[PDB]
Amino acid sequence: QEDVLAKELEDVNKWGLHVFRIAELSGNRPLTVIMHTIFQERDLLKTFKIPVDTLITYLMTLEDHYHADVAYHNNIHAADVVQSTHVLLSTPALEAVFTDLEILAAIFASAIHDVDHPGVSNQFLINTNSELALMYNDSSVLENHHLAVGFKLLQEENCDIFQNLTKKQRQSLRKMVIDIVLATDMSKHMNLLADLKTMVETKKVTSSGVLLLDNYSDRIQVLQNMVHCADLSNPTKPLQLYRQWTDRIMEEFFRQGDRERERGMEISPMCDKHNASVEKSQVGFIDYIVHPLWETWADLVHPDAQDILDTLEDNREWYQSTIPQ
Ligand SMILES: COc1ccc(C2=NN(C3CCN(c4nc(N)nc5ccccc45)CC3)C(=O)[C@@H]3CC=CC[C@H]23)cc1OC
Ligand SMILES: COc1ccc(C2=NN(C3CCN(c4nc(N)nc5ccccc45)CC3)C(=O)[C@@H]3CC=CC[C@H]23)cc1OC
Ligand SMILES: [Mg+2]
Ligand SMILES: [Zn+2]
């Protein structure tokens, strides 16, 4: 192998990279190999003076804090979200829009955004009186935790990849990362999407020209939505990848359902393996969450995302066509 891995990683800039193959070929290190590849490609190690073995140490440590016994929310998902963010950042319509620090922030935020995920929802954590829910006052419990862990890991031996940033740089980056990860909580989705829509309309009536994001609020909003799109990108991928993501999320959700049915709590939506149509849930996920978001994103970067939207629509028809009687 290894030479085969190098060959697969040549697809790093493409939508639809075989991320599950990369995970197999790297000894279950897709996050480390993908992040390293992206960092080298974008010359981020030179730009921010990140020593290479410090980066690798951090990445291996981060990756080890993702759980391999969690079906969906593991290191492969993290890797997928990083790589997807990387491709979105390279979309023609955003060329030269974002600084190197902003790029760094978005890619870092993607890498850490689900770290130490236990495989159960915020509502489940809240309902069981978990220590995490008690620490974070039932508010974006998981996302606050992902951030805390991602930042804390920089303190392990030879893990401080930001050692060479200036203080002002660290401060800015820290704020962006926080804003970005907290925006991955689905309770924020409707407000995020409303703002994005507003921005899109504003653009249509203001300028046929290039994108102008002149204050933090608009800039961060686009970054938030970008990583949120990457987080919600499974149904936009080649169907063979999408179906594996569907298998994984349903295994995680059904396992939460099994833990909820015992203890007599309400089974969360889509978590009842005795009463659930996987295919129907995918169509609903597309119709109510993924397509409205991606259609709006596609509008912002028109026509860069047309093929992603076409894939989404074909993928929706696939699940729609296989819904049981
Ligand atoms: C003697 O002179 C060199 C010897 C080896 C390398 C090596 N470079 N690299 C990277 C290391 C991290 N980078 C930079 N980091 C930081 N903090 N500062 C930089 C300043 C200017 C350019 C790059 C960096 C990006 C490149 C490898 O990955 C090689 C393979 C394995 C180990 C080190 C090698 C570079 C040299 O001079 C630039
Ligand atoms: C591959 O397939 C999926 C991948 C990820 C997720 C994810 N799902 N979600 C939620 C999304 C909205 N949900 C719905 N709830 C309620 N009451 N009603 C609904 C009606 C129609 C559609 C959805 C819902 C609950 C779960 C997360 O919170 C995950 C973590 C972060 C981002 C997305 C993840 C789902 C997938 O397929 C269903
Ligand atoms: Mg999450
Ligand atoms: Zn995620």
mmCIF file of C-alpha atoms and ligand atoms in Angstrom:
data_model
loop_
_atom_site.group_PDB
_atom_site.id
_atom_site.type_symbol
_atom_site.label_atom_id
_atom_site.label_comp_id
_atom_site.label_asym_id
_atom_site.label_seq_id
_atom_site.Cartn_x
_atom_site.Cartn_y
_atom_site.Cartn_z
ATOM 1 C CA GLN A 1 0.000 0.000 0.000
ATOM 2 C CA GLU A 2 1.182 3.599 0.790
ATOM 3 C CA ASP A 3 1.893 4.367 -2.862
ATOM 4 C CA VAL A 4 -1.772 3.598 -3.342
ATOM 5 C CA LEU A 5 -2.535 6.067 -0.577
ATOM 6 C CA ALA A 6 -0.490 8.803 -2.228
ATOM 7 C CA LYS A 7 -2.461 8.176 -5.405
ATOM 8 C CA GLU A 8 -5.852 8.447 -3.624
ATOM 9 C CA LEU A 9 -4.712 11.694 -1.987
ATOM 10 C CA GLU A 10 -4.219 13.235 -5.421
ATOM 11 C CA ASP A 11 -8.043 13.627 -5.277
ATOM 12 C CA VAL A 12 -7.801 15.885 -2.212
ATOM 13 C CA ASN A 13 -9.130 18.859 -4.177
ATOM 14 C CA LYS A 14 -12.136 17.019 -5.567
ATOM 15 C CA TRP A 15 -15.618 16.639 -4.289
ATOM 16 C CA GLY A 16 -16.170 12.969 -3.745
ATOM 17 C CA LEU A 17 -12.797 11.837 -2.565
ATOM 18 C CA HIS A 18 -12.907 8.179 -1.483
ATOM 19 C CA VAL A 19 -12.531 9.024 2.198
ATOM 20 C CA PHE A 20 -13.353 5.515 3.431
ATOM 21 C CA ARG A 21 -10.532 4.150 1.257
ATOM 22 C CA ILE A 22 -8.108 6.706 2.626
ATOM 23 C CA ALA A 23 -9.158 5.607 6.134
ATOM 24 C CA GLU A 24 -8.375 1.942 5.268
ATOM 25 C CA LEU A 25 -5.090 2.720 3.519
ATOM 26 C CA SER A 26 -3.739 5.018 6.334
ATOM 27 C CA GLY A 27 -4.292 2.601 9.180
ATOM 28 C CA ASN A 28 -7.375 4.530 10.224
ATOM 29 C CA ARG A 29 -5.669 7.891 10.119
ATOM 30 C CA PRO A 30 -7.684 9.805 7.502
ATOM 31 C CA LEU A 31 -7.869 12.965 9.593
ATOM 32 C CA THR A 32 -4.067 13.156 10.035
ATOM 33 C CA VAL A 33 -3.194 12.337 6.422
ATOM 34 C CA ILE A 34 -5.856 14.582 4.941
ATOM 35 C CA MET A 35 -5.079 17.537 7.161
ATOM 36 C CA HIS A 36 -1.356 17.170 6.537
ATOM 37 C CA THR A 37 -1.916 17.013 2.809
ATOM 38 C CA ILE A 38 -4.139 20.077 2.865
ATOM 39 C CA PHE A 39 -1.781 22.029 5.055
ATOM 40 C CA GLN A 40 1.135 21.306 2.742
ATOM 41 C CA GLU A 41 -0.929 22.093 -0.328
ATOM 42 C CA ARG A 42 -2.022 25.400 0.993
ATOM 43 C CA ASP A 43 1.514 26.179 2.241
ATOM 44 C CA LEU A 44 0.055 26.768 5.731
ATOM 45 C CA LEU A 45 3.102 25.343 7.546
ATOM 46 C CA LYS A 46 5.415 27.939 5.978
ATOM 47 C CA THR A 47 2.897 30.753 6.327
ATOM 48 C CA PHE A 48 2.241 30.241 10.027
ATOM 49 C CA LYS A 49 5.608 28.664 10.906
ATOM 50 C CA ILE A 50 4.043 25.477 12.155
ATOM 51 C CA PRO A 51 6.804 22.889 12.616
ATOM 52 C CA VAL A 52 5.823 19.761 10.720
ATOM 53 C CA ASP A 53 6.213 17.238 13.564
ATOM 54 C CA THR A 54 4.308 19.512 15.865
ATOM 55 C CA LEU A 55 1.420 19.471 13.370
ATOM 56 C CA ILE A 56 1.579 15.701 13.024
ATOM 57 C CA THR A 57 1.689 15.246 16.824
ATOM 58 C CA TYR A 58 -1.357 17.498 17.238
ATOM 59 C CA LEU A 59 -3.205 15.722 14.425
ATOM 60 C CA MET A 60 -2.522 12.226 15.773
ATOM 61 C CA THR A 61 -3.601 13.375 19.202
ATOM 62 C CA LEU A 62 -6.782 14.991 17.847
ATOM 63 C CA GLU A 63 -7.595 11.904 15.820
ATOM 64 C CA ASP A 64 -7.177 9.684 18.870
ATOM 65 C CA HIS A 65 -9.783 11.767 20.666
ATOM 66 C CA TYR A 66 -12.397 10.838 18.123
ATOM 67 C CA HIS A 67 -14.001 7.523 18.927
ATOM 68 C CA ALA A 68 -13.630 4.632 16.631
ATOM 69 C CA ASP A 69 -16.663 2.868 18.245
ATOM 70 C CA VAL A 70 -19.020 5.646 17.214
ATOM 71 C CA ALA A 71 -20.506 4.814 13.841
ATOM 72 C CA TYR A 72 -20.809 8.236 12.263
ATOM 73 C CA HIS A 73 -19.242 10.853 14.520
ATOM 74 C CA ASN A 74 -15.702 9.538 14.324
ATOM 75 C CA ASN A 75 -12.397 10.525 12.710
ATOM 76 C CA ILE A 76 -13.630 9.633 9.215
ATOM 77 C CA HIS A 77 -16.481 12.121 9.503
ATOM 78 C CA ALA A 78 -13.970 14.711 10.768
ATOM 79 C CA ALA A 79 -11.704 14.050 7.813
ATOM 80 C CA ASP A 80 -14.668 14.316 5.397
ATOM 81 C CA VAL A 81 -15.746 17.642 6.842
ATOM 82 C CA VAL A 82 -12.157 19.011 6.650
ATOM 83 C CA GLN A 83 -11.776 17.902 3.042
ATOM 84 C CA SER A 84 -15.184 19.232 2.055
ATOM 85 C CA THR A 85 -14.444 22.562 3.657
ATOM 86 C CA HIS A 86 -11.155 22.597 1.755
ATOM 87 C CA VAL A 87 -12.977 22.170 -1.587
ATOM 88 C CA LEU A 88 -15.606 24.828 -0.683
ATOM 89 C CA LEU A 89 -12.869 27.284 0.293
ATOM 90 C CA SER A 90 -11.355 26.774 -3.184
ATOM 91 C CA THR A 91 -14.642 27.572 -5.013
ATOM 92 C CA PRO A 92 -13.960 30.136 -7.852
ATOM 93 C CA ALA A 93 -16.487 32.645 -6.510
ATOM 94 C CA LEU A 94 -14.517 32.953 -3.224
ATOM 95 C CA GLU A 95 -11.057 33.226 -4.755
ATOM 96 C CA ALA A 96 -8.994 35.742 -2.739
ATOM 97 C CA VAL A 97 -11.958 36.612 -0.541
ATOM 98 C CA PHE A 98 -10.546 35.113 2.708
ATOM 99 C CA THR A 99 -7.183 35.674 4.390
ATOM 100 C CA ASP A 100 -4.778 32.869 5.230
ATOM 101 C CA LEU A 101 -5.820 33.181 8.862
ATOM 102 C CA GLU A 102 -9.446 32.758 7.943
ATOM 103 C CA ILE A 103 -8.616 29.710 5.863
ATOM 104 C CA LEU A 104 -6.616 28.259 8.727
ATOM 105 C CA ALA A 105 -9.495 28.924 11.128
ATOM 106 C CA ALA A 106 -12.038 27.221 8.903
ATOM 107 C CA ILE A 107 -9.922 24.120 8.314
ATOM 108 C CA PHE A 108 -8.990 23.868 12.033
ATOM 109 C CA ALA A 109 -12.597 24.315 13.068
ATOM 110 C CA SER A 110 -13.617 21.509 10.651
ATOM 111 C CA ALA A 111 -10.978 19.157 12.115
ATOM 112 C CA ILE A 112 -12.030 19.639 15.700
ATOM 113 C CA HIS A 113 -15.726 20.227 15.202
ATOM 114 C CA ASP A 114 -16.941 16.817 16.540
ATOM 115 C CA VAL A 115 -13.979 15.741 18.664
ATOM 116 C CA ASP A 116 -14.805 13.429 21.642
ATOM 117 C CA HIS A 117 -18.367 12.899 20.328
ATOM 118 C CA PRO A 118 -20.083 10.139 22.391
ATOM 119 C CA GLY A 119 -22.504 9.224 19.657
ATOM 120 C CA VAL A 120 -25.629 10.568 21.307
ATOM 121 C CA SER A 121 -27.475 13.867 20.836
ATOM 122 C CA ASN A 122 -27.516 17.012 22.959
ATOM 123 C CA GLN A 123 -31.087 16.185 24.009
ATOM 124 C CA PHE A 124 -30.040 12.758 25.220
ATOM 125 C CA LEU A 125 -27.178 14.293 27.262
ATOM 126 C CA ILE A 126 -29.587 16.807 28.755
ATOM 127 C CA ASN A 127 -32.250 14.220 29.560
ATOM 128 C CA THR A 128 -29.876 11.833 31.348
ATOM 129 C CA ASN A 129 -28.442 14.669 33.493
ATOM 130 C CA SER A 130 -25.008 14.080 32.097
ATOM 131 C CA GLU A 131 -22.033 15.864 33.585
ATOM 132 C CA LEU A 132 -21.471 17.554 30.208
ATOM 133 C CA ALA A 133 -24.997 18.941 30.098
ATOM 134 C CA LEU A 134 -24.605 20.184 33.699
ATOM 135 C CA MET A 135 -21.253 21.898 32.855
ATOM 136 C CA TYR A 136 -22.684 23.618 29.746
ATOM 137 C CA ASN A 137 -26.152 24.473 31.035
ATOM 138 C CA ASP A 138 -27.915 22.401 28.419
ATOM 139 C CA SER A 139 -26.733 24.819 25.671
ATOM 140 C CA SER A 140 -24.900 23.546 22.577
ATOM 141 C CA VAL A 141 -23.525 20.961 25.003
ATOM 142 C CA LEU A 142 -21.617 18.882 22.463
ATOM 143 C CA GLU A 143 -20.320 21.824 20.418
ATOM 144 C CA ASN A 144 -18.974 23.655 23.467
ATOM 145 C CA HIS A 145 -17.253 20.397 24.430
ATOM 146 C CA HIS A 146 -15.780 19.803 20.979
ATOM 147 C CA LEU A 147 -14.245 23.289 21.126
ATOM 148 C CA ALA A 148 -12.929 22.902 24.679
ATOM 149 C CA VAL A 149 -11.263 19.596 23.809
ATOM 150 C CA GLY A 150 -9.832 20.801 20.508
ATOM 151 C CA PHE A 151 -8.220 23.804 22.149
ATOM 152 C CA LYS A 152 -7.075 21.881 25.233
ATOM 153 C CA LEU A 153 -5.194 19.353 23.123
ATOM 154 C CA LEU A 154 -2.878 22.142 21.892
ATOM 155 C CA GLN A 155 -1.389 21.975 25.448
ATOM 156 C CA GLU A 156 -0.177 18.373 25.179
ATOM 157 C CA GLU A 157 3.520 17.749 24.561
ATOM 158 C CA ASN A 158 4.688 19.203 21.197
ATOM 159 C CA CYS A 159 1.086 19.888 20.072
ATOM 160 C CA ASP A 160 0.926 23.701 19.991
ATOM 161 C CA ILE A 161 0.586 24.314 16.277
ATOM 162 C CA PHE A 162 -0.168 27.978 16.849
ATOM 163 C CA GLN A 163 2.995 28.716 18.810
ATOM 164 C CA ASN A 164 4.320 30.967 16.061
ATOM 165 C CA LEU A 165 1.221 33.068 15.489
ATOM 166 C CA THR A 166 1.254 36.556 16.887
ATOM 167 C CA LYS A 167 -0.978 37.237 19.827
ATOM 168 C CA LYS A 168 -3.401 39.185 17.686
ATOM 169 C CA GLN A 169 -3.490 36.270 15.290
ATOM 170 C CA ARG A 170 -4.267 33.743 18.027
ATOM 171 C CA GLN A 171 -7.048 35.905 19.368
ATOM 172 C CA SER A 172 -8.672 36.321 15.973
ATOM 173 C CA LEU A 173 -8.318 32.680 15.083
ATOM 174 C CA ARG A 174 -9.696 31.594 18.412
ATOM 175 C CA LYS A 175 -12.808 33.724 17.972
ATOM 176 C CA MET A 176 -13.427 32.467 14.456
ATOM 177 C CA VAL A 177 -13.043 28.833 15.405
ATOM 178 C CA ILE A 178 -15.464 29.270 18.247
ATOM 179 C CA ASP A 179 -18.006 31.056 16.050
ATOM 180 C CA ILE A 180 -17.662 28.351 13.420
ATOM 181 C CA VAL A 181 -17.996 25.287 15.690
ATOM 182 C CA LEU A 182 -20.894 26.688 17.658
ATOM 183 C CA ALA A 183 -22.680 27.226 14.335
ATOM 184 C CA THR A 184 -22.572 23.408 13.737
ATOM 185 C CA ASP A 185 -25.284 22.857 16.356
ATOM 186 C CA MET A 186 -28.479 22.168 14.353
ATOM 187 C CA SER A 187 -30.477 24.329 16.734
ATOM 188 C CA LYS A 188 -28.730 27.318 15.018
ATOM 189 C CA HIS A 189 -29.464 26.084 11.459
ATOM 190 C CA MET A 190 -32.676 28.066 10.749
ATOM 191 C CA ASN A 191 -31.180 31.400 11.878
ATOM 192 C CA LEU A 192 -27.963 30.737 9.978
ATOM 193 C CA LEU A 193 -29.851 29.877 6.817
ATOM 194 C CA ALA A 194 -32.077 32.975 7.175
ATOM 195 C CA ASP A 195 -29.009 35.180 7.353
ATOM 196 C CA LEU A 196 -27.409 33.501 4.419
ATOM 197 C CA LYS A 197 -30.611 34.011 2.398
ATOM 198 C CA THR A 198 -30.623 37.674 3.358
ATOM 199 C CA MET A 199 -27.039 37.998 2.223
ATOM 200 C CA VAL A 200 -27.814 36.259 -1.036
ATOM 201 C CA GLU A 201 -30.751 38.592 -1.772
ATOM 202 C CA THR A 202 -28.674 41.619 -0.831
ATOM 203 C CA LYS A 203 -26.032 40.516 -3.324
ATOM 204 C CA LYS A 204 -28.560 40.017 -6.131
ATOM 205 C CA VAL A 205 -29.985 43.520 -5.768
ATOM 206 C CA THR A 206 -26.596 45.237 -5.135
ATOM 207 C CA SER A 207 -24.107 43.813 -7.578
ATOM 208 C CA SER A 208 -23.647 41.550 -10.528
ATOM 209 C CA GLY A 209 -19.970 41.989 -9.517
ATOM 210 C CA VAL A 210 -17.644 40.215 -7.121
ATOM 211 C CA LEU A 211 -18.440 39.313 -3.507
ATOM 212 C CA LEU A 212 -17.811 41.972 -0.981
ATOM 213 C CA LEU A 213 -17.614 40.951 2.639
ATOM 214 C CA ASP A 214 -16.420 44.100 4.447
ATOM 215 C CA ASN A 215 -17.147 43.440 8.186
ATOM 216 C CA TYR A 216 -16.584 40.512 10.541
ATOM 217 C CA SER A 217 -20.193 39.684 10.817
ATOM 218 C CA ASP A 218 -20.630 38.943 7.138
ATOM 219 C CA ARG A 219 -17.320 37.239 6.796
ATOM 220 C CA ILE A 220 -17.883 34.904 9.720
ATOM 221 C CA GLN A 221 -21.416 34.182 8.576
ATOM 222 C CA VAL A 222 -20.119 32.877 5.278
ATOM 223 C CA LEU A 223 -17.491 30.736 7.038
ATOM 224 C CA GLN A 224 -20.063 29.382 9.477
ATOM 225 C CA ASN A 225 -22.343 28.414 6.623
ATOM 226 C CA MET A 226 -19.517 26.943 4.648
ATOM 227 C CA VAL A 227 -18.502 24.556 7.409
ATOM 228 C CA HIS A 228 -22.175 23.882 8.142
ATOM 229 C CA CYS A 229 -22.598 22.971 4.447
ATOM 230 C CA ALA A 230 -19.587 20.676 4.719
ATOM 231 C CA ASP A 231 -21.107 19.090 7.829
ATOM 232 C CA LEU A 232 -24.373 18.583 5.843
ATOM 233 C CA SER A 233 -22.649 17.487 2.606
ATOM 234 C CA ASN A 234 -23.227 13.684 2.777
ATOM 235 C CA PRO A 235 -26.276 13.736 0.387
ATOM 236 C CA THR A 236 -24.308 15.874 -2.137
ATOM 237 C CA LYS A 237 -21.631 13.278 -2.540
ATOM 238 C CA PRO A 238 -21.473 10.361 -5.092
ATOM 239 C CA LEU A 239 -24.224 7.987 -4.102
ATOM 240 C CA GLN A 240 -21.819 5.228 -3.107
ATOM 241 C CA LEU A 241 -20.344 7.529 -0.450
ATOM 242 C CA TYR A 242 -23.715 8.895 0.582
ATOM 243 C CA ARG A 243 -25.158 5.408 1.259
ATOM 244 C CA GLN A 244 -22.296 4.542 3.583
ATOM 245 C CA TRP A 245 -22.890 7.793 5.485
ATOM 246 C CA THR A 246 -26.578 6.907 5.716
ATOM 247 C CA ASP A 247 -25.739 3.433 7.086
ATOM 248 C CA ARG A 248 -23.454 5.020 9.707
ATOM 249 C CA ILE A 249 -25.801 7.746 10.899
ATOM 250 C CA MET A 250 -28.714 5.262 11.170
ATOM 251 C CA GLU A 251 -26.580 2.834 13.183
ATOM 252 C CA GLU A 252 -25.717 5.727 15.583
ATOM 253 C CA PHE A 253 -29.322 6.934 15.779
ATOM 254 C CA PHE A 254 -30.764 3.395 16.267
ATOM 255 C CA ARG A 255 -28.223 2.782 19.069
ATOM 256 C CA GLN A 256 -29.391 5.972 20.755
ATOM 257 C CA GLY A 257 -32.946 4.733 20.261
ATOM 258 C CA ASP A 258 -32.065 1.386 21.905
ATOM 259 C CA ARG A 259 -30.596 3.311 24.897
ATOM 260 C CA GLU A 260 -33.772 5.537 25.039
ATOM 261 C CA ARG A 261 -36.422 2.719 24.739
ATOM 262 C CA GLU A 262 -34.974 1.159 27.827
ATOM 263 C CA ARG A 263 -35.406 3.942 30.455
ATOM 264 C CA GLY A 264 -38.745 4.896 28.917
ATOM 265 C CA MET A 265 -37.771 8.148 27.456
ATOM 266 C CA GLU A 266 -39.449 9.335 24.220
ATOM 267 C CA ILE A 267 -37.504 7.799 21.267
ATOM 268 C CA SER A 268 -35.914 10.746 19.395
ATOM 269 C CA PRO A 269 -37.018 11.337 15.724
ATOM 270 C CA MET A 270 -35.549 8.693 13.338
ATOM 271 C CA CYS A 271 -34.052 6.659 16.257
ATOM 272 C CA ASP A 272 -36.676 3.853 16.475
ATOM 273 C CA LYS A 273 -35.369 0.817 14.532
ATOM 274 C CA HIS A 274 -38.779 -0.867 14.891
ATOM 275 C CA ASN A 275 -40.588 2.154 13.568
ATOM 276 C CA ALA A 276 -38.368 3.938 11.056
ATOM 277 C CA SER A 277 -37.986 4.320 7.384
ATOM 278 C CA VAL A 278 -34.448 5.142 6.633
ATOM 279 C CA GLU A 279 -35.284 6.122 3.082
ATOM 280 C CA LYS A 280 -38.107 8.369 4.092
ATOM 281 C CA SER A 281 -35.878 10.057 6.705
ATOM 282 C CA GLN A 282 -33.261 10.841 4.031
ATOM 283 C CA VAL A 283 -35.863 12.409 1.788
ATOM 284 C CA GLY A 284 -37.078 14.514 4.712
ATOM 285 C CA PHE A 285 -33.507 15.462 5.668
ATOM 286 C CA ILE A 286 -32.908 16.569 2.072
ATOM 287 C CA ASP A 287 -36.215 18.371 1.620
ATOM 288 C CA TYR A 288 -36.256 20.261 4.876
ATOM 289 C CA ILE A 289 -32.594 20.818 5.756
ATOM 290 C CA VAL A 290 -29.944 19.931 3.158
ATOM 291 C CA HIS A 291 -31.600 21.214 -0.084
ATOM 292 C CA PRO A 292 -32.740 24.601 1.262
ATOM 293 C CA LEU A 293 -29.202 25.164 2.608
ATOM 294 C CA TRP A 294 -27.315 23.961 -0.486
ATOM 295 C CA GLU A 295 -29.662 25.807 -2.887
ATOM 296 C CA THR A 296 -28.932 28.996 -1.011
ATOM 297 C CA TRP A 297 -25.181 28.272 -0.879
ATOM 298 C CA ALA A 298 -25.296 27.470 -4.624
ATOM 299 C CA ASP A 299 -26.948 30.870 -5.182
ATOM 300 C CA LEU A 300 -24.184 32.664 -3.269
ATOM 301 C CA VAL A 301 -21.425 31.051 -5.356
ATOM 302 C CA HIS A 302 -23.465 30.681 -8.609
ATOM 303 C CA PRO A 303 -22.703 28.668 -10.753
ATOM 304 C CA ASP A 304 -19.862 26.924 -8.886
ATOM 305 C CA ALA A 305 -22.096 24.465 -7.004
ATOM 306 C CA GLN A 306 -24.446 23.512 -9.867
ATOM 307 C CA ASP A 307 -23.059 19.968 -10.145
ATOM 308 C CA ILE A 308 -23.277 19.428 -6.364
ATOM 309 C CA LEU A 309 -26.937 20.521 -6.485
ATOM 310 C CA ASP A 310 -27.573 18.186 -9.418
ATOM 311 C CA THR A 311 -26.076 15.317 -7.491
ATOM 312 C CA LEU A 312 -28.202 16.189 -4.426
ATOM 313 C CA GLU A 313 -31.373 16.076 -6.550
ATOM 314 C CA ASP A 314 -30.422 12.734 -8.100
ATOM 315 C CA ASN A 315 -29.573 11.398 -4.696
ATOM 316 C CA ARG A 316 -32.909 12.555 -3.350
ATOM 317 C CA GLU A 317 -34.672 10.673 -6.145
ATOM 318 C CA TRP A 318 -32.757 7.559 -5.292
ATOM 319 C CA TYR A 319 -34.021 7.451 -1.725
ATOM 320 C CA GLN A 320 -37.472 8.633 -2.782
ATOM 321 C CA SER A 321 -37.678 5.764 -5.239
ATOM 322 C CA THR A 322 -36.761 3.193 -2.613
ATOM 323 C CA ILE A 323 -39.171 4.147 0.111
ATOM 324 C CA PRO A 324 -41.141 1.006 1.109
ATOM 325 C CA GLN A 325 -44.864 0.464 0.647
HETATM 326 C C1 LIG B 1 17.345 23.209 6.207
HETATM 327 O O1 LIG B 1 16.128 23.647 5.600
HETATM 328 C C2 LIG B 1 15.052 22.803 5.581
HETATM 329 C C3 LIG B 1 15.072 21.467 5.945
HETATM 330 C C4 LIG B 1 13.918 20.703 5.877
HETATM 331 C C5 LIG B 1 12.717 21.257 5.444
HETATM 332 C C6 LIG B 1 11.442 20.471 5.407
HETATM 333 N N1 LIG B 1 10.343 21.095 5.161
HETATM 334 N N2 LIG B 1 9.158 20.461 5.414
HETATM 335 C C7 LIG B 1 8.106 21.399 5.912
HETATM 336 C C8 LIG B 1 8.428 21.818 7.337
HETATM 337 C C9 LIG B 1 7.377 22.743 7.847
HETATM 338 N N3 LIG B 1 7.377 23.939 7.007
HETATM 339 C C10 LIG B 1 7.901 25.115 7.482
HETATM 340 N N4 LIG B 1 7.729 25.225 8.812
HETATM 341 C C11 LIG B 1 8.236 26.260 9.495
HETATM 342 N N5 LIG B 1 8.019 26.265 10.800
HETATM 343 N N6 LIG B 1 8.970 27.245 8.929
HETATM 344 C C12 LIG B 1 9.171 27.177 7.563
HETATM 345 C C13 LIG B 1 9.897 28.199 6.924
HETATM 346 C C14 LIG B 1 10.101 28.161 5.575
HETATM 347 C C15 LIG B 1 9.591 27.108 4.809
HETATM 348 C C16 LIG B 1 8.894 26.102 5.406
HETATM 349 C C17 LIG B 1 8.657 26.120 6.805
HETATM 350 C C18 LIG B 1 6.933 23.635 5.642
HETATM 351 C C19 LIG B 1 7.876 22.611 5.003
HETATM 352 C C20 LIG B 1 8.951 19.112 5.304
HETATM 353 O O2 LIG B 1 7.891 18.561 5.531
HETATM 354 C C21 LIG B 1 10.214 18.371 4.934
HETATM 355 C C22 LIG B 1 10.118 16.851 5.124
HETATM 356 C C23 LIG B 1 10.280 16.453 6.550
HETATM 357 C C24 LIG B 1 10.808 17.245 7.462
HETATM 358 C C25 LIG B 1 11.250 18.645 7.191
HETATM 359 C C26 LIG B 1 11.416 18.978 5.695
HETATM 360 C C27 LIG B 1 12.692 22.604 5.088
HETATM 361 C C28 LIG B 1 13.841 23.378 5.137
HETATM 362 O O3 LIG B 1 13.906 24.708 4.821
HETATM 363 C C29 LIG B 1 12.725 25.378 4.381
HETATM 364 C C1 LIG B 2 -26.473 10.876 6.116
HETATM 365 O O1 LIG B 2 -27.670 11.256 6.787
HETATM 366 C C2 LIG B 2 -27.556 12.152 7.811
HETATM 367 C C3 LIG B 2 -26.373 12.716 8.282
HETATM 368 C C4 LIG B 2 -26.384 13.589 9.356
HETATM 369 C C5 LIG B 2 -27.583 13.866 10.005
HETATM 370 C C6 LIG B 2 -27.685 14.781 11.168
HETATM 371 N N1 LIG B 2 -28.847 14.982 11.659
HETATM 372 N N2 LIG B 2 -28.922 15.878 12.694
HETATM 373 C C7 LIG B 2 -30.321 16.302 12.930
HETATM 374 C C8 LIG B 2 -30.955 16.866 11.668
HETATM 375 C C9 LIG B 2 -32.354 17.321 11.960
HETATM 376 N N3 LIG B 2 -33.186 16.280 12.572
HETATM 377 C C10 LIG B 2 -34.541 16.298 12.368
HETATM 378 N N4 LIG B 2 -35.214 16.487 13.510
HETATM 379 C C11 LIG B 2 -36.562 16.585 13.515
HETATM 380 N N5 LIG B 2 -37.168 16.726 14.686
HETATM 381 N N6 LIG B 2 -37.316 16.554 12.397
HETATM 382 C C12 LIG B 2 -36.662 16.405 11.187
HETATM 383 C C13 LIG B 2 -37.416 16.373 9.996
HETATM 384 C C14 LIG B 2 -36.788 16.230 8.794
HETATM 385 C C15 LIG B 2 -35.399 16.078 8.733
HETATM 386 C C16 LIG B 2 -34.646 16.113 9.872
HETATM 387 C C17 LIG B 2 -35.269 16.282 11.134
HETATM 388 C C18 LIG B 2 -32.584 15.517 13.674
HETATM 389 C C19 LIG B 2 -31.139 15.136 13.453
HETATM 390 C C20 LIG B 2 -27.930 16.297 13.546
HETATM 391 O O2 LIG B 2 -28.154 17.072 14.479
HETATM 392 C C21 LIG B 2 -26.595 15.672 13.231
HETATM 393 C C22 LIG B 2 -25.391 16.418 13.820
HETATM 394 C C23 LIG B 2 -25.047 17.631 13.022
HETATM 395 C C24 LIG B 2 -25.442 17.826 11.777
HETATM 396 C C25 LIG B 2 -26.354 16.891 11.048
HETATM 397 C C26 LIG B 2 -26.457 15.505 11.706
HETATM 398 C C27 LIG B 2 -28.759 13.241 9.578
HETATM 399 C C28 LIG B 2 -28.755 12.389 8.487
HETATM 400 O O3 LIG B 2 -29.851 11.739 7.978
HETATM 401 C C29 LIG B 2 -31.094 11.875 8.686
HETATM 402 MG MG MG B 3 -21.473 18.182 15.651
HETATM 403 ZN ZN ZN B 4 -20.193 16.906 12.217
#
